[PDB]
Amino acid sequence: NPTKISILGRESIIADFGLWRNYVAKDLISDCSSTTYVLVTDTNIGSIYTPSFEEAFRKRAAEITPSPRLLIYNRPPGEVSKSRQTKADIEDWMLSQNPPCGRDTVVIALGGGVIGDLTGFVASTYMRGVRYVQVPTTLLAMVDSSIGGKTAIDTPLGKNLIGAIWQPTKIYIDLEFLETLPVREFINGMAEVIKTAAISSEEEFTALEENAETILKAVRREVTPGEHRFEGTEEILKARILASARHKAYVVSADEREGGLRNLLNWGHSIGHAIEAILTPQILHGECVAIGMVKEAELARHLGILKGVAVSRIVKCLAAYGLPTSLKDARIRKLTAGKHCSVDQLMFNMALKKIVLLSAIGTPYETRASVVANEDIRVVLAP
Amino acid sequence: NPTKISILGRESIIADFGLWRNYVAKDLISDCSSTTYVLVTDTNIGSIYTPSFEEAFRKRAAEITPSPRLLIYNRPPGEVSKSRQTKADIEDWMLSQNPPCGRDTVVIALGGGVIGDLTGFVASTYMRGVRYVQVPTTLLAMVDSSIGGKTAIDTPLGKNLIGAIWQPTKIYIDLEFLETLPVREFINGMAEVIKTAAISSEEEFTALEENAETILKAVRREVTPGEHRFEGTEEILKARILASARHKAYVVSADGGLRNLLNWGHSIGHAIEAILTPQILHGECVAIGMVKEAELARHLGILKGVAVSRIVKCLAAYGLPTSLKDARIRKLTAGKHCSVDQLMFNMAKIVLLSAIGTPYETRASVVANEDIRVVLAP
Ligand SMILES: NC(=O)c1ccc[n+]([C@@H]2O[C@H](COP(=O)([O-])OP(=O)(O)OC[C@H]3O[C@@H](n4cnc5c(N)ncnc54)[C@H](O)[C@@H]3O)[C@@H](O)[C@H]2O)c1
Ligand SMILES: NC(=O)c1ccc[n+]([C@@H]2O[C@H](COP(=O)([O-])OP(=O)(O)OC[C@H]3O[C@@H](n4cnc5c(N)ncnc54)[C@H](O)[C@@H]3O)[C@@H](O)[C@H]2O)c1
Ligand SMILES: [Cl-]
Ligand SMILES: [Zn+2]
Numbered sequence: 091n092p093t094k095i096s097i098l099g100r101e102s103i104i105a106d107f108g109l110w111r112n113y114v115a116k117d118l119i120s121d122c123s124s125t126t127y128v129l130v131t132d133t134n135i136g137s138i139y140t141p142s143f144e145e146a147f148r149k150r151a152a153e154i155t156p157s158p159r160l161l162i163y164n165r166p167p168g169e170v171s172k173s174r175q176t177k178a179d180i181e182d183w184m185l186s187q188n189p190p191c192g193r194d195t196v197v198i199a200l201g202g203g204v205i206g207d208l209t210g211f212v213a214s215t216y217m218r219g220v221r222y223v224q225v226p227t228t229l230l231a232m233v234d235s236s237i238g239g240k241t242a243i244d245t246p247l248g249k250n251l252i253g254a255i256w257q258p259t260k261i262y263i264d265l266e267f268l269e270t271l272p273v274r275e276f277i278n279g280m281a282e283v284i285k286t287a288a289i290s291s292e293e294e295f296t297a298l299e300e301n302a303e304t305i306l307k308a309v310r311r312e313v314t315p316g317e318h319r320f321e322g323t324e325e326i327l328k329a330r331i332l333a334s335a336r337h338k339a340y341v342v343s344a345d346e347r348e349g350g351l352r353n354l355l356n357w358g359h360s361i362g363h364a365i366e367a368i369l370t371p372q373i374l375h376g377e378c379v380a381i382g383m384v385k386e387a388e389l390a391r392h393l394g395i396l397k398g399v400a401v402s403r404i405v406k407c408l409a410a411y412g413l414p415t416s417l418k419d420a421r422i423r424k425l426t427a428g429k430h431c432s433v434d435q436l437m438f439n440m441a442l443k444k445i446v447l448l449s450a451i452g453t454p455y456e457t458r459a460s461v462v463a464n465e466d467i468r469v470v471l472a473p
Numbered sequence: 474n475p476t477k478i479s480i481l482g483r484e485s486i487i488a489d490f491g492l493w494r495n496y497v498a499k500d501l502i503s504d505c506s507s508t509t510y511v512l513v514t515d516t517n518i519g520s521i522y523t524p525s526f527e528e529a530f531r532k533r534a535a536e537i538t539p540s541p542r543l544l545i546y547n548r549p550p551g552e553v554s555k556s557r558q559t560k561a562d563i564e565d566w567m568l569s570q571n572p573p574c575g576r577d578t579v580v581i582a583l584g585g586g587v588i589g590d591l592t593g594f595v596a597s598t599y600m601r602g603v604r605y606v607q608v609p610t611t612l613l614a615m616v617d618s619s620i621g622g623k624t625a626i627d628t629p630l631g632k633n634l635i636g637a638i639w640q641p642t643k644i645y646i647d648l649e650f651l652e653t654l655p656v657r658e659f660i661n662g663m664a665e666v667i668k669t670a671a672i673s674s675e676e677e678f679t680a681l682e683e684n685a686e687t688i689l690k691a692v693r694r695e696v697t698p699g700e701h702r703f704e705g706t707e708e709i710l711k712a713r714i715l716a717s718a719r720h721k722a723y724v725v726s727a728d729g730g731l732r733n734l735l736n737w738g739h740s741i742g743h744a745i746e747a748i749l750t751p752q753i754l755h756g757e758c759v760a761i762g763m764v765k766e767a768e769l770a771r772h773l774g775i776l777k778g779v780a781v782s783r784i785v786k787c788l789a790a791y792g793l794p795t796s797l798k799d800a801r802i803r804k805l806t807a808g809k810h811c812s813v814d815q816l817m818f819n820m821a822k823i824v825l826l827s828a829i830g831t832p833y834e835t836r837a838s839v840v841a842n843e844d845i846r847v848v849l850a851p
């Protein structure tokens with residue numbers, strides 16, 4: 091059965107195994123009536139998933155007169171496509187169609203965080219705004235990037251500098267996409283899942299601790315023909331992933347005077363972003379956020395706010411899912427030959443302190459990021 | 474007297490003679506607190522108006538501490554600057570400042586429709602959105618472009634293709650800008666003023682008819698550097714221009730319907746413009762469109778022939794063309810012809826008038842292509 095989660099007081103999220111394979115096309119043409127559908131993705135994702143959809147779309151466009159059209163745009167993979175150049179590329183491409191794409195256009199964002207931010211931003215300004223849907227194909231996109239409307243592209247000077255808040259009409263979460271997602275990317279996305287649980291539900295966190303071995307085994311297993319990577323553990327994977335997605339939706343949907351409940355989502359990102367500013371692009375975002383979570387967890391313990399046992403759980407849980415819990419992680423070192431993260435550099439990258447503090451697994455200290463002394467931060471980052 | 478109007482619920486429009494010279498700076502720093510203010514304009518407008526403001530800003534920044542900063546960006550004049558390149562150059566420039574312009578930045582759009590659309594769009598996406606104010610310097614901008622939140626840039630394949638709805642925090646209308654606005658541009662802007670009146674108030678339309686000689690004289694007379702072009706007729710100019718502006722503001726606030734009325738004379742007007750541009754200006758084309766669309770309604774037995782004539786006399790009174798055969802226009806468009814086919818083709822529903830200050834339907838009406846032709850053809 092398809093699970094539904096709402097965003098900003100309305101239906102928006104539809105999650106299940108096989109949506110892309112048999113549900114999205116029909117749904118779009120039905121609930122997102124348009125004459126034109128523009129699908130944006132990269133060559134990796136697309137070469138694997140675009141063919142089936144083209145057929146499923148053709149099969150759904152036929153039971154209608156006249157038949158809506160599906161236009162496909164394949165961008166090269168990587169953070170590099172999240173640029174002004176590609177935004178203008180996709181746009182001119184869309185304007186140059188016969189007939190050109192109009193304000194009724196429904197853009198389909200089939201990809202991870204990169205394609206998501208790019209496509210969302212394209213849609214936000216196309217003729218001052220057109221509808222679009224998110225079809226996250228990475229774990230991180232499913233529970234984070236595709237939720238909340240934050241759209242943008244990069245500039246040589248920094249990440250997500252030019253963009254917009256543009257909400258998607260719908261977010262289709264097809265867990266089957268995780269069947270072909272590279273093991274490292276999957277692990278990477280788990281950083282947000284564990285973060286979410288860590289700051290919202292102790293029960294959820296425990297479920298993550300208990301489901302690690304099973305989940306990871308499935309993520310690494312050799313799939314025999316006729317099988318689906320996650321057969322046998324579908325409910326576990328769905329309950330775990332949707333718990334995070336759902337939380338993100340709740341936080342983003344909760345306003346009517348809140349102050350900064352959204353702030354708690356940055357737990358582990360204060361230090362995590364600092365670390366990433368140095369180790370990127372060798373080390374992924376989640377990998378850096380994982381380490382940031384451990385450091386920030388130690389900090390709170392250092393300030394006598396977090397019990398030492400919670401730190402250890404936080405550490406075993408991340409490692410159980412394959413995430414690094416230290417800056418000298420064997421894997422990290424091999425990928426970043428000649429990169430060091432000195433306290434000074436980290437204390438610097440951070441100043442460019444307010445760290446969400448935890449008082450217990452599933453329980454934040456303040457309802458917002460707390461203010462901590464630079465000296466206390468340095469001690470934590472000491473060798 | 475600093476007049477105030479409301480857009481989208483409440484006040485945002487401030488109109489008067491001299492606002493730029495001694496009010497915006499203080500106002501911005503007070504009502505739009507920020508550490509950074511980015512002024513965007515073109516070399517024409519800026520070379521005339523940026524110096525005073527710089528001083529007026531410095532004079533107001535000193536009163537507050539630490540003193541804010543004013544960053545100026547001068548773009549070349551023309552429709553050509555309303556492009557992706559200029560948007561990116563402005564963005565890159567802002568981000569390059571030391572320190573980089575943050576989300577607290579308040580962008581000042583000092584210019585006409587071009588600078589307005591460009592700057593508004595820049596502001597809408599800068600770090601996903603930052604505040605900005607409109608300081609329209611052309612008549613058309615004062616009563617139309619600077620109002621409504623419509624922002625964008627052009628593409629070789631068309632105008633305003635990439636943009637967004639981004640409302641300005643404030644719209645400062647300093648009528649003194651019209652002192653240096655080229656006569657042709659001023660006349661051009663009058664097309665929207667006359668259009669607005671034509672579809673909203675018969676009294677207002679009549680006031681435009683009676684002010685015609687006076688306004689034009691002020692516009693066409695030779696003013697000497699130091700004397701104000703509009704001394705003696707300031708209330709007339711203010712009441713006329715603000716009337717148009719306040720109406721656009723009203724409709725933009727109501728809301729597919731009431732907004733459709735704002736397009737009277739633009740159905741044919743845009744078709745004509747698609748051919749005659751860039752030689753012929755938007756207002757000049759909209760003027761002719763108004764006459765055509767007015768005769769169409771007369772053709773359909775909805776408009777009295779007398780209203781058509783008044784519409785025709787008023788446009789002409791203000792120096793706007795009322796036919797494709799206009800000498801100015803023919804001379805200016807040598808090498809071009811608006812065949813009826815091309816116009817119909819370009820047209821691919823017109824707002825009909827039942828009387829001066831009175832629309833037919835509450836929205837654009839559906840008319841048969843044949844009735845249109847018998848009105849486009851000679
Ligand atoms: N609020 C927001 O909008 C927000 C917040 C967090 C992250 N992000 C953005 O997300 C981006 C990173 O996104 P990401 O971690 O999803 O990485 P990504 O989109 O770069 O995807 C990683 C890799 O996986 C491949 N891939 C994607 N789906 C696949 C699948 N199911 N099968 C096979 N290959 C697949 C891609 O081709 C790519 O190589 C960053 O640029 C970041 O700024 C945005
Ligand atoms: N909804 C909207 O936002 C909207 C609606 C209608 C028109 N527009 C757009 O507006 C643009 C047209 O703008 P416009 O007609 O105001 O012309 P414009 O901005 O191109 O200005 C015309 C000329 O006058 C000069 N100038 C401007 N003000 C001056 C002043 N006070 N003193 C001296 N010289 C001055 C300029 O340098 C320029 O050369 C078009 O690009 C059009 O697409 C936007
Ligand atoms: Cl853009
Ligand atoms: Zn993150």
Ligand SMILES: [Zn+2]
Pocket residue numbers: 617665755759
């Ligand atoms: Zn107009």
